[PDB]
Amino acid sequence: ISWLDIYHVVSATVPLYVSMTLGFLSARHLKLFSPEQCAGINKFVAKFSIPLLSFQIISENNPFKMSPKLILSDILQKFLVVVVLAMVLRFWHGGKLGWVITGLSISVLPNTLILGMPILSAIYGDEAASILEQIVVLQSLIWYTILLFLFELNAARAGTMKILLKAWRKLIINPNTYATLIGIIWATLHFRLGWNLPEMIDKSIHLLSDGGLGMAMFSLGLFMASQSSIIACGTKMAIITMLLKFVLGPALMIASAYCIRLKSTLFKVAILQAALPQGVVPFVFAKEYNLHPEIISTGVIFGMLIALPTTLAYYFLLDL
Amino acid sequence: ISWLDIYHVVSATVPLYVSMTLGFLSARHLKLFSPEQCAGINKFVAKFSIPLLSFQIISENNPFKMSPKLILSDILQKFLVVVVLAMVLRFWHGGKLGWVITGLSISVLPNTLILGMPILSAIYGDEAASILEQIVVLQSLIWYTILLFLFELNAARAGTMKILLKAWRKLIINPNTYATLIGIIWATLHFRLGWNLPEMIDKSIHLLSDGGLGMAMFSLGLFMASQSSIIACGTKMAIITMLLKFVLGPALMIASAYCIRLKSTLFKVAILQAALPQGVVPFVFAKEYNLHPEIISTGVIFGMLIALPTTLAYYFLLDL
Numbered sequence: 071i072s073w074l075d076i077y078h079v080v081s082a083t084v085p086l087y088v089s090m091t092l093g094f095l096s097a098r099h100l101k102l103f104s105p106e107q108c109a110g111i112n113k114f115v116a117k118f119s120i121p122l123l124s125f126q127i128i129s130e131n132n133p134f135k136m137s138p139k140l141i142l143s144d145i146l147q148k149f150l151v152v153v154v155l156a157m158v159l160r161f162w163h164g165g166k167l168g169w170v171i172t173g174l175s176i177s178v179l180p181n182t183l184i185l186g187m188p189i190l191s192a193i194y195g196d197e198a199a200s201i202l203e204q205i206v207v208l209q210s211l212i213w214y215t216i217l218l219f220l221f222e223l224n225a226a227r228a229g230t231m232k233i234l235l236k237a238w239r240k241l242i243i244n245p246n247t248y249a250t251l252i253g254i255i256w257a258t259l260h261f262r263l264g265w266n267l268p269e270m271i272d273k274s275i276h277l278l279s280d281g282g283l284g285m286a287m288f289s290l291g292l293f294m295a296s297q298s299s300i301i302a303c304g305t306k307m308a309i310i311t312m313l314l315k316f317v318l319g320p321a322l323m324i325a326s327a328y329c330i331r332l333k334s335t336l337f338k339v340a341i342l343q344a345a346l347p348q349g350v351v352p353f354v355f356a357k358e359y360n361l362h363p364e365i366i367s368t369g370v371i372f373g374m375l376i377a378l379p380t381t382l383a384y385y386f387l388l389d390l
Numbered sequence: 391i392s393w394l395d396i397y398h399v400v401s402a403t404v405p406l407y408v409s410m411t412l413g414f415l416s417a418r419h420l421k422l423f424s425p426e427q428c429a430g431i432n433k434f435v436a437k438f439s440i441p442l443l444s445f446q447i448i449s450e451n452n453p454f455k456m457s458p459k460l461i462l463s464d465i466l467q468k469f470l471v472v473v474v475l476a477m478v479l480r481f482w483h484g485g486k487l488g489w490v491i492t493g494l495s496i497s498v499l500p501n502t503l504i505l506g507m508p509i510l511s512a513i514y515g516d517e518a519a520s521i522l523e524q525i526v527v528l529q530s531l532i533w534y535t536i537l538l539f540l541f542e543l544n545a546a547r548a549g550t551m552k553i554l555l556k557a558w559r560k561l562i563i564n565p566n567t568y569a570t571l572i573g574i575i576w577a578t579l580h581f582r583l584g585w586n587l588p589e590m591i592d593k594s595i596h597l598l599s600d601g602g603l604g605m606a607m608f609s610l611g612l613f614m615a616s617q618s619s620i621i622a623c624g625t626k627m628a629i630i631t632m633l634l635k636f637v638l639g640p641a642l643m644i645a646s647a648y649c650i651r652l653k654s655t656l657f658k659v660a661i662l663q664a665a666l667p668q669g670v671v672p673f674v675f676a677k678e679y680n681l682h683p684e685i686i687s688t689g690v691i692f693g694m695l696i697a698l699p700t701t702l703a704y705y706f707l708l709d710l
């Protein structure tokens with residue numbers, strides 16, 4: 071672990087905190103944004119920035135050149151996490167479905183796009199970049215849509231066939247689903263027939279997509295200024311939010327990798343990626359749907375602080 | 391002229407119209423955003439994105455390698471538009487000072503920060519970038535401050551030290567002022583001593599500044615949707631606002647360019663930049679001070695529509 075490699079991690083993490091700070095200061099000390107305005111900014115982030123980012127992620131990779139072992143391992147990890155959460159909730163802590171979503175939003179949705187590429191590139195070779203790209207594409211194609219479907223189903227519940235039909239009806243109009251579908255279609259078209267996206271469309275998409283992550287962090291800092299303080303999540307809930315993200319998710323990912331027989335850099339990069347801090351998109355969704363938005367906030371705040379400790383610990387463990 | 395050039399300009403301009411149309415549809419038709427949410431988004435873009443973009447543009451300029459001929463041309467463009475507005479108003483339309491500010495907020499304040507770099511950097515490549523950034527620096531450092539002082543003087547007119555003090559107090563709480571000062575200082579340091587911005591700070595600034603143009607157009611579209619109609623005022627003061635920007639301003643700028651003997655790209659760019667539609671800061675000042683906010687809004691809304699039609703015309707004309 072070269073000392074100059076810690077500089078890379080810190081440089082990848084600090085910018086995601088500068089915007090968050092700016093937002094917190096604007097909301098609390100400057101009293102610049104009212105709660106309605108913060109909700110509107112978050113809605114813009116969730117409706118225009120995230121769909122375009124997902125489209126770009128999905129439309130810039132080879133759908134037919136993708137490690138199937140990586141896909142199977144990710145699916146197995148997600149299924150195992152869902153099963154474990156369902157089993158635990160049955161005996162621990164009504165409103166059980168609301169906690170299954172809040173578990174997947176802090177367990178099986180890392181932030182490999184921002185904090186993953188630099189950390190893995192510094193600690194591993196170029197192949198890790200491709201593996202992380204594939205993981206991000208999968209989580210922005212399948213998992214980010216399944217999470218939205220679950221959110222819609224939870225909102226509708228607040229006779230079963232009617233609820234499912236309502237959830238599907240509300241999902242089909244969601245920008246994220248259409249963005250993902252168009253992204254996959256364009257990816258296959260461009261990588262089979264060689265079609266290239268016209269410049270007037272690529273630039274238009276980039277203009278809105280660009281700066282979306284800064285806006286998401288701004289919204290995260292804005293929402294954290296309307297809570298009790300910085301750990302409004304609580305004391306025990308904040309402690310378990312990290313055992314779910316750095317002690318259970320990584321273990322289940324290791325189990326999935328063992329089951330799928332991963333033996334390559336597709337192992338030391340497939341497991342380490344699962345120990346990275348939480349993403350911002352899960353918060354962007356959990357605050358628009360108002361499903362425990364305080365639990366996926368302190369987790370984000372305190373996950374990028376311990377990213378380096380836990381990541382280096384897992385790196386040492388894998389080598390041993 | 392070749393159709394390829396016309397197509398290049400159209401492609402450069404299309405994304406900035408797609409963002410505006412998306413914002414307008416989201417506000418009015420799709421009804422994603424409530425008026426409070428739209429106001430919050432406008433405040434965010436005007437407080438965090440625009441100042442950072444201004445700082446970046448200013449820092450990407452060389453104070454010691456400016457063009458004094460361009461400086462003089464820009465100062466004489468806004469000094470004989472005053473001598474043409476103080477003479478016409480003598481024989482046309484009490485409120486000479488009020489109308490002069492409204493006449494200056496239209497003719498000689500192009501939007502060279504949001505809609506000037508993209509279009510012109512594409513029409514003439516990267517050569518025009520230096521000229522546009524120099525003009526942006528000048529209008530952010532001198533002309534906006536003078537406009538603020540004139541607005542304060544008009545407000546107090548319906549001693550001088552009190553007006554200057556009020557202008558200074560209101561100028562210190564403006565993010566644009568701090569952004570411009572810091573950008574000038576950093577450009578001086580970088581281009582004299584050779585210092586380089588740290589990677590962390592650069593990435594943090596880019597996180598928010600990247601989306602400062604697409605989101606600016608989105609906010610413009612939201613504002614257009616907020617207004618009741620395109621032509622808020624009457625035709626009498628609507629067919630004159632366009633002629634005060636696409637006929638009088640460019641003509642008086644061509645006169646300045648001939649007096650100062652500007653030649654080459656510094657001419658085809660120095661006149662073309664004056665034909666761009668009006669900015670939004672003058673509208674903000676007019677709304678805050680309530681100085682004819684129904685004409686400065688009409689101009690800003692009806693120039694964004696016919697910018698490309700009236701920009702291709704000047705592009706074709708100047709080639710001869």
Ligand SMILES: CCCCC/C=C/C/C=C/CCCCCCCC(=O)OC[C@H](COP(=O)([O-])OCC[N+](C)(C)C)OC(=O)CCCCCCC/C=C/C/C=C/CCCCC
Binds near residue numbers: 102568587
């Ligand atoms: C050197 C750092 C100077 C920091 C300047 C801050 C000074 C603090 C000001 C104190 C005066 C008290 C009044 C403060 C109000 C302005 C706040 C502000 O101005 O806050 C930054 C601004 C956002 O203000 P606001 O709109 O949110 O609220 C302000 C509007 N109202 C008042 C309505 C809420 O917008 C921005 O982000 C500005 C972005 C451009 C500045 C980027 C600085 C980068 C640093 C460059 C220098 C680097 C040198 C190399 C050295 C490297 C090693 C260290």
Ligand SMILES: O=C(O)COc1ccc(Cl)cc1Cl
Binds near residue numbers: 440501610
């Ligand atoms: O540069 C300009 O004159 C216009 O750019 C803007 C566009 C939208 C908003 Cl809110 C603020 C600004 Cl300054």
